[model samples]
Target: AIIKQMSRYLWPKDSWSDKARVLLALSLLVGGKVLNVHVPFYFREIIDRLNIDVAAVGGTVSAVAGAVIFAYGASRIGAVVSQELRNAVFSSVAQKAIRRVATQTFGHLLNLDLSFHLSKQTGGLTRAIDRGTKGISYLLTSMVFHIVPTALEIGMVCGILTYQFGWEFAAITAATMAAYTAFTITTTAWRTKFRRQANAADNAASTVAVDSLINYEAVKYFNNEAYEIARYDKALQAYERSSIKVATSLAFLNSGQNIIFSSALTLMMWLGARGVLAGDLSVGDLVLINQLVFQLSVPLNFLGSVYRELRQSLLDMETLFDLQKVNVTIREAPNAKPLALPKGGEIRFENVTFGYYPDRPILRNLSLTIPAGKKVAVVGPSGCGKSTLLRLLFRSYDPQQGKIFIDDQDIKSVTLESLRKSIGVVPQDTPLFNDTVELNIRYGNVNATQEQVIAAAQKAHIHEKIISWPHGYQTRVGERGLMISGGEKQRLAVSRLILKDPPLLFFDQATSALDTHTEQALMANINEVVKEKKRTALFVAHRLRTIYDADLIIVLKEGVVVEQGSHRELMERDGVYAEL
Candidate 1:
């Protein structure tokens, strides 16, 4: 069951490294088992030889004793070497399987839609994958080299005992193993809940820590350090209690396993001693039985722990596999082609109707035309589908009841990558990566050189500020660009868009976060960039001041367009646009 669950990820598909490792590990394992089994036999021979009269045998005594002692030592050393070689060979296979699973899981996460990411707790999701991969590594190594081989060794020992000492010793060994395994599994199964609960508590605490830290300023402003600590402490206390339960249960399992093994050993030795007294077995034979049982004990003790861990590992794999099985809501059409940007960058919305929720429609029969190389501004109240239009234009979400076209090409028919590449968005919140200023600008066009990056920053009016910093372009922007002011971040966003130089630009309230003085400066820079290239642009704005010079201003109210004209024409009409 474990093998079948993990087989897809256990071995690399493109290379023979894992296959060769497995073969080598198997050969060494067989050699080790042989050496391990015979070590006891040589010890028995040495003990039996010690019972002889060495003094009367002259020089023969020394020669005979030396040979037996050497053989015993050689066998022990050979066993150790074989075992070590097996482990060394198989280690790569275990590590590769872990890497494969971890990488695959991470890629799957990136492919999932924004909805999946928004709804998930970052800490919980990461914790699941982390624990799942660790489980994979543990199970792979233990099953291959420890659990399966141990079972094989037990069989070999039992078979030898049956041949040499009779069925009684073999029966006692087999029965003890069976009982120990059953007890371990049952007790471990009961303890798995405690383990899961501990993990949940730990994940919760991590979530709290991460969230609190992300909102570092908010916590400080509210003076809520103690409140956050109290919440985190509650989760930690729960985890501590669960850990205690797990430790106590483990102790019980270990105690029961030892007791069962001790009882079985006592019975087997009693039988062996009786055989010696009745002259059915020699002193050497009794010692051999004792040595065999002692040898089996090592694996027998580990068997319980291995079985318990194997069960837990299976559960972990199942959780990650279940995550992989979730179906993506958005899928590309089978025959989708790359977007074709023709001579004109004209955008048109035809009878678009959509909603985030089925009962609350945001865009209803919204139809508008953005002529080629024109600046169109969309202004509306909150929840009036202004931003929704931009989202549809970018194909972030498809309209439920219309076809959106760019240069007469249906967006749905085009590949998403090509479609997005033609459009550039400067969102209201300019979230910057925690990296150097140069790298953040270069993100828009990875192929852009340092000179090109500096030029774009200069065009956005941010180059002077960037150079004044001690590190210049090398200064790190803290997480979400918190190190920079709002105007600075917006200017950086403009710099990125300048670098991208997309044919269709959507500035969704881009300058809303800036002060009046900074907003005018940023707007002047935006006007220069767009007019120079004659690029088609859509500006969605809450502030009326930004769109005064727009060629066409669209005023929407309650998911429908109420007014549309130039700013002067709308103000002359003294309607909704003028009223706003």
Candidate 2:
């Protein structure tokens, strides 16, 4: 499905490179058919030359020599063309895929509704991409060359055998060939057809095992190794049953090929011997026929396996490209302008309504404004629109029926790259990659120097902790930085934001998971970076205590801004803000 959607880009192009690749694939087919046919004729030439006249001898030798030259050139050229096709297809597809496709794919995957993400197995999704990418790569390389040539070789060989070898020889070759194929396929189908299902079960079981391992602390605390092992063993048994069938099928196939080839060779030899005794055929004629038949068997066997794998891989590539073809909810407007904050950072939300999922609105017709250089807090209970409000500010998703403006320029009207560059978000989950502490922090500002990176780290109060490690600032944060404490991770995230120094800073659930002491420590560190005179800040807080000092506090409920005022002013109102 993935390749199917992508096919229009590849086909019907008048480009020189595309024409070259298509020609190459055609060359492979021509060369393969010729190679299969030429070998048998060479065998006949050898037989005819035996005790032949000078002229006849010369003719026979020239014919044999010409066939050899043709076969050699075909094989060599075919291989070169195959490699060229592989490279051409891979490069062309990589280049032709739109940035919009990549951006949309990336954005959609990241913003997939939480419920949608929760329903999927992460390992399964990763494996599908991993396998699908490789399968598509294989389709570009092997299938295009192998399947077509194998089919052509089979068809052409059979045609030649039928036309030149007489009715009896052709009948025996085709009939016996068909019978052996049917038997091989039938036995294999009967034995190992459940392999895919069993493998899938094993993959699922393994996924569960790996997921549990990720939560090793819980597993170890409960001492559930024995239970885990037992479950895993059951999955293994299912997989083993499937493997036994595949093995049995392969054994039957190999055996059938041997029997079928031996019988056919024996019959052909008997017929050739009888013809020689009766002077009905020349020595060269018999040899050529035998060689041709032998050559046909090789391609026949190759056809069976190559055809099956090609079919399945094409099916797999289809699914992957299909996902790529999906439209991302967040995309650029046709004539969007670059967004920039002039003089300072001011935010305006005008009648904005937004939803992660279409039917479930998280923010509804909410209007608000933050003057340049203001420290604003968005506070509400869980399931309120605080986080969603922040997401809209970043234009992560456009509101269904409202405008979000920065300096009065609608967020949707602005180019995403420009808008995002000015707005820095420290997400609730805290983005951390598997890299050095310095590198992870510096990610927010790719051009920041080492000194600037250290400055940010010092401001975030993570400098001392980072310098304590053996590698100092270069200390690697192992996968997702789980090796570090949560507070340390938060500090690292804050350091990244400080390095960015965007006009607007969003602290999303900034102190949600910290102990009171750690929260206080980090807050003190962030005091300078959260300057009300220099930067506009959107701080999302779940607890009143976290936003008590904010210049403005907005309490939202069910996608509506229920109350907006300074923290003390809201407290005086005794509304949802004070009640919470």
Candidate 3:
């Protein structure tokens, strides 16, 4: 499916340029091939002329040297063409894909549902992509210039033999070449299958090594070194088995092809001797045939190897493009426009009914209205769809059966981009890029000024920490902002939300990872923000204690709402809320 979608991109107007590059590459190969066949003729002619007359030596020697020089030039041009094409492909297109395309591609991979991920081998997929890229680079370069022309040269030599040395010689030479190729291809195909399996095993072993090292602390704590070793050993044993199969098959193929090709050489020599003895062919002609046969065969060997690699590389490329083509559930419709919510930010869930899967309803005809500027806290037990409820209201996924209204406008009528821009959400885990803290906060709103960014950071209670760093606002977060503490990352994400100051705010288990001290500090800051006029809130919390003062706390168990009231009212009722 991925390849099918990407096929248009891979084989479109750009192929015109690729076709030109391919032609240039073929020219180089043809030049090289011509040189290979002619060099032998030049040598044989020089030898024959020397035997005929001593004074013919200098001219013949110069002629042979000139032929060598010409061949060398062809080789150089081929190399240059290959290099230029590779550089163009890498620098011009592959590295510079648009941000929207990248996002859609990654999101598709992320949303492939559990079963899809389970069926695929992650390690092998990664290795395949990496190896495939390198293989494509070579296939684009060497195979076009060197491999293809070599085969052409072989065909030309067979034609020459048939015309000059009779069909007997041509038949022997052509038959030998064909048999060599067929044998090589058949053996390489079988061996490469095992090679791929070996590669997969290697990936499995690497994954085990990575897991063991990264979790060394836990392993030591649990005294599980032996278990780790046993798992690693099992992976290594599989790798060994696959490797042996590949290596043994390759050896068998090499030996078999060599025997067949050598037999052909012996047959050519036998025929050439007979022609020389009978005066049917000149000594120079026999010598030239011998040289051309060897020259042609060398390229045939290269062609076989290139053929094997190119097949595997194309398969790898298919996988990469396939990944890029995965269909995303969330997509913007053509010509969709933005929706405008009420100025006061009133929100209502009107008969909302949705579920990730059928036969298990998370919100069943649920209806609730938060008057403009009201703060609502949704509390639920584990697996109680607290997170799913927030996702629905945020329009991460539209409801199947009901409409959600922002003020009075149906949210579905608006473009997703614009509707999402109207609200700011700080997720449970803050994923920040490897950039300055200021840049991350400003990501929420590209138009945000430096002062606005700083103000938001201050509001999130992370301004002091940011300033304490040596680079202040310029401090790098490193990969996924791993350099920062859990609470710090949360506050950093909060700062982005703060900078946006959207009319609607969503805290989806945002502060769940923070310790009590940080949670208290964050909650205090949030209380002030949540009470601000025109700012509506939908907070999902695991612990009800965090939202004891919320305007209303809706209690959910499984997918059903068990109760809904203010904290005091619920406590007075002495029900599920009181029990919690």
Best by TM-score: 1
RMSD of each: 7.2, 7.5, 7.3
Candidate 1: Cα lDDT at 169: 86
TM-score of each: 0.82, 0.74, 0.74
Task: Put the candidates in TM-score order, highest first.
Answer: 1, 2, 3
Q: How many backbone clashes does candidate 1 have?
A: 0
**Model 1 CA lDDT for position 86:** 87
Clashing pairs in 3: 2-322
The lDDT values for all models are 0.80, 0.69, 0.71
lDDT, model 1:
0.80
Superposed by TM-score, candidate 2 places the C-alpha of residue 37 at a distance from the truth, in angstroms, of 3.9
* Pairs in clash, predicted candidate 1: none
Off by over 4 Å in 1: 1-3, 6-14, 49-51, 58-62, 65-68, 81-91, 183-257, 276-282, 299-312, 480-482, 571-580
Candidate 3, overall lDDT? 0.71
Order by lDDT, highest first: 1, 3, 2
Residues 1-580 of candidate 1: C-alpha lDDT, one tens digit per residue: 6445455454544468677777788888988888888888888887887777667753564566778788888988998898889888777767777787778888898777766887899787788898887777777778667877778777888999899888888888888777877887788778888788878888988999999999989999999999999988987888788889888888988888779888987888799899989888878877777777777677554554676577787788677766677777657777888755756888888888988886889888888888899998987665567877777877777788988888787888888888889999888888777888899899899999999999999888888898888788898886744288878888888899999989899889886763778888878888988896778988888765567788888888767777788765665432243343
CA error at residue 209 for candidate 1, angstroms: 24
In candidate 2, how many Å is residue 157 off? 3.0
Candidate 3 TM-score versus the reference: 0.74
